[PDB]
Amino acid sequence: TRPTVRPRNDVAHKQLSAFGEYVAEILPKYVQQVQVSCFSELEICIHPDGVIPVLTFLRDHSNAQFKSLADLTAVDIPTRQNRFEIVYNLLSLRFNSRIRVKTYTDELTPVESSVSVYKAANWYEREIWDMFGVFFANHPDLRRILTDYGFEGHPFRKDFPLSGYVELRYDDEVKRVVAEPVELAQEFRKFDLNSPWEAFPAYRQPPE
């Protein structure tokens, strides 16, 4: 399997597994799962009451020093009752490593804002509000950041359509750009591309 297969990094896999054990036993109040991927990335899956303790630990601990918030992300998964998956990508410059911190909420439970831990998060979780509707409690200036000013709904939710609900045009009668319900001259043609045959037997979910 030499030329075309990605070579596995066993050293970093073992190191990130040991550090995941370390984080799981220092913070067992909040840590739910710890998993290391096959391409050597460490995910810490936490309870959302420990956003500030887990991130402050990873920022300030002498064996962590994850001083850099790379990215902050929600993922909408509608089949879960806590459908929003808040992902924290942290970067350690001292130990040259990355860690993923993941937690959950639904549409109504707020997540505690992490601008006291990372000032990078100020626009990121504001974008998560704008795109998903995840309210972040005790945020300095939480409002929209990317959508238009009168915009209704949260576009990156998966029950939100691709073209939205309203579209704009200029109207010469009222001398004003107006919002009218969306009508496409050509509908977005949905392609059912999924193959009816299983591709990855290692990822097979067990039957009921």
Binding site: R169, Y170, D171, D172, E173, K175, E180, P181, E183, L184, A185
Partner: protein
């Protein structure tokens, strides 16, 4: 009814209204808002234009792709009128002038060109023709405008007997020459009573006359809700505008009172609420700014 002209959609920009309209005189004040309100339904609008194509640019954002067809036409050319009307199912006539020029007088603008358009639309099988006269059009009127426009009303009725003739009183809007005339005149007060009508009311009435089959052969009188004396109307215009090119035919028409014809239907027989001047006068006259409302009769 052919399959491509069956209405579809929810009545929006990409929908199909089933209205294929040729609007003569579409580059003017009324044609602007008529092509606006047609193209937001998804109508195939045909715009014969006499002018420079730069002056028809504002009509292109008014409908979806391929829904406004521009073409050259001449008022004395029946070939261009036929080339414009032979595919439409409604022809709206909006050709007019406040002043007569070297080539086109009031008779050519109000008698020759309307009867030519109505006759050519008649022989091209166009089902609906909608002609715009004036409310004060009279054979015995003192202004040459209203005499030629009454004669043209007569000829359009007797060459297209199912046409919908419409009598606007004095249309006010942003691009009018009624409130913008008084805001710039800075003529005198007489015994004149007027009831001006808003342009969106006139446009909604023309479209409700397109859609209603009971408007064929009728004559409508589009008037506002409130009759005003001329003098306190002009003082209300100067009061809204925060203020302390003419000819004698325009003076003959300003000092000609709006006749009341209750035997003719109006905007309420087309289902249009007449908008009063007090709501839209600020919208017209905010541009002229560097108020007790007008007394009705």
């Amino acid at each position: 009814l052919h399959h491509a002209v069956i209405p579809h959609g929810k009545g929006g920009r990409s929908s199909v209204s089933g209205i294929v309209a040729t609007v003569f005189g579409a580059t003017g004040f009324l044609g602007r808002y008529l092509v606006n309100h047609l193209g937001r339904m998804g109508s195939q609008v045909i715009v014969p234009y006499r002018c420079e194509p730069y002056d028809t640019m504002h009509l292109r954002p008014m409908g979806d792709l391929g829904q406004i067809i521009f073409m050259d036409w001449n008022g004395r050319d029946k070939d261009s009128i036929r080339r414009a009307v032979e595919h439409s199912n409604v022809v709206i006539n909006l050709v007019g002038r406040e002043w007569e020029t070297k080539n086109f007088d009031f008779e050519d603008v109000f008698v020759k060109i309307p009867q030519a358009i109505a006759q050519v639309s008649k022989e091209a099988g166009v089902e609906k023709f909608i002609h715009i006269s004036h409310l004060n059009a009279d054979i015995k009127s003192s202004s040459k405008y209203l005499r030629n426009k009454a004669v043209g009303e007569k000829e359009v009725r007797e060459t297209f007997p199912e046409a919908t003739i419409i009598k606007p009183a004095d249309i006010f809007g942003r691009e009018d020459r009624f409130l913008n005339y008084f805001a710039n005149i800075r003529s005198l007060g007489k015994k004149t009573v007027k009831q001006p009508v808003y342009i969106v009311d006139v446009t909604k009435g023309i479209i409700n006359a397109i859609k209603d089959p009971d408007a064929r052969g009728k004559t409508f009188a589009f008037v506002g809700p409130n009759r005003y004396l001329l003098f306190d109307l002009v003082q209300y215009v100067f009061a809204v505008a925060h203020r302390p090119w003419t000819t004698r035919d325009k003076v003959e028409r300003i000092h000609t009172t709006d006749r009341t014809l209750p035997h003719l239907p109006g905007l309420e027989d087309l289902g249009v609420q007449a908008t009063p001047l007090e709501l839209k006068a600020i919208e017209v006259l905010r541009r002229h700014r560097t108020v007790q409302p007008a007394k009705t009769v």
